[PDB]
Amino acid sequence: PRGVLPRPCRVLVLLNPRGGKGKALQLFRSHVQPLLAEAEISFTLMLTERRNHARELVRSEELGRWDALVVMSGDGLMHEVVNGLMERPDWETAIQKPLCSLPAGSGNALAASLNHYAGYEQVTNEDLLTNCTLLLCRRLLSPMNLLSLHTASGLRLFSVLSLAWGFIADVDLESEKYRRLGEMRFTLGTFLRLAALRTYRGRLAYLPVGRVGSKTPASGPVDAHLVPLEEPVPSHWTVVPDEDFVLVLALLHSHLGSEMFAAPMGRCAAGVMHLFYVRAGVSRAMLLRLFLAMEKGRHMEYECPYLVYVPVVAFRLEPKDGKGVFAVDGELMVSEAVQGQVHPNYFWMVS
């Protein structure tokens, strides 16, 4: 399925100005605006001031007046937007409002992925901003998967990009102290965490796409592959025997950053996400090799037996590692048992 924005069209631009090392508004004016004017895209800028501001704005927004919502930021702002749409009473129609991700200078994994799918070379910073803006100007829409998440505490959350636990989430946390470095904050965080490598105790189970296929089962949204966290996972799932991990990563897209091609095995099918995990026992040196190889998406060629990849429609993760974190679409939260189901072709993105 494909769709197209009308011409002219009218979009809302949600922009975080204290973001892009404080340059997002300037970049919008210099790199985005002239292209929108030429493509007959009129806009209104709405500025975000703090965490969840966008979530609460989109939750209460009159959506009928916009042809799309444009988010100019990192991955976190898009997370907030989609979560705002999904918590509305009219969520079933609100989630069908076309969305567009423009990177603001501190990176954006979703924008990098969309640039990749469109056939562009793996560019960064202003070049990436330009390409993603040209995709908006071209007006074509593609459906994206959405991961519906439930935690032991009853939290209900949606993920457009990733859920990370272990090493990756710890890097997301550590890297908040280094925002001045831009996207390289994640590389520094990786080295620091690698220097202090640890494993994390927990249990992982998943429902591979091969077992049931990606069609949504009849019982919202309804997550009919899930049973309650207080019950054992269903007998037809796969339970991983390992009790200790270096990391676990659910990933809906090809990239973890503009220069991190994490999932080179092809764009996800409708209703399917990538699941990666790294088993305990791997060396620091191999983990470094894998990290560096991820730039050109060559890390799977090592055939390291500690790195396992599987395409899934659902999963459950039960951390038993004491106080820790998850990163959901790069956003930090306290870790606890969690499970999720992928919904196919659930929203539209400019792409």
Ligand X SMILES: Cc1cc(CS(=O)(=O)c2ccccc2)cc(OCc2ccc(CN3CCC[C@@H]3CO)cc2)c1
Instruction: Quickly list DSSP for 71-131.
Output: EEESHHHHHHHHHHHHTSTTHHHHTTS-EEEEE-SS--HHHHHHHHHTT-----HHHHHHH
User: Catalytic residue at 75?
Assistant: yes
Query: To the nearest whole angstrom, how small is the minimum distance from the Cβ of residue 256 to ligand X?
Result: 4
Residue 331 assigned ligand-binding role: yes
For ligand X, the closer CB: 15 or 307 = 307
CB of 72 to ligand X, least distance (A): 16
Catalytic one of 67, 75, 90, 223: 75
Binding site for ligand X (CB under 6 A): 75, 109, 162, 164, 167-168, 171-172, 186, 190, 194, 249, 256-257, 260, 262, 276, 278, 287, 290-291, 294, 299, 307, 327, 330
- Using CA atoms, how far apart are residues 264 and 276, in angstroms rounded to an integer? 12
Amino acid present at 2: R
How near is the Cβ of 327 to ligand X at its closest, in Å?
A: 4
Nearer to ligand X, 141 or 160 (CB): 160
Give the span between the Cα atoms of 336 and 152, in whole angstroms.
6
Binding residue per annotation — 175?
A: no
Between strands 255-257 and 244-251, the pairing is: unpaired
84/330 with CB nearer ligand X: 330
Closest CA to 187 of 68, 107, 301: 107
Distance between CA atoms of residues 261 and 124, nearest Å: 13
SS3 228: coil
Tokens coding 113: 């992925």
On whether the CB atoms of residues 110 and 260 are closer than 8 A, the answer is no
Annotated binding residue at 67? no
Q: Among residues 131 and 162, whose Cβ is nearest to ligand X?
A: 162
55 annotated to a ligand binding site: no
203 is known to lie in a ligand binding site: no
Helix (H, G, I), strand (E, B) or coil at 60: coil
Q: Least separation, in Å, of the C-beta of 336 and ligand X? A: 17
242 is in an annotated binding site: no
Provide the minimum distance between the beta carbon of 259 and ligand X in the complex, in angstroms, as a whole number: 10
Comparison of 13 and 327: residue with beta carbon closer to ligand X: 327
Rounded Cα distance, 290 and 284, in Å: 10
Neighbour-count burial of 148, counting CB atoms closer than 10 A to its CB (0-12 exposed, 13-18 middle, 19+ buried): buried
Active site (catalytic) residues: 75
Binding residues for substrate: 73-76, 172
Binding residues for ATP: 16-18, 48-52, 80, 105-107, 179, 185, 329-331
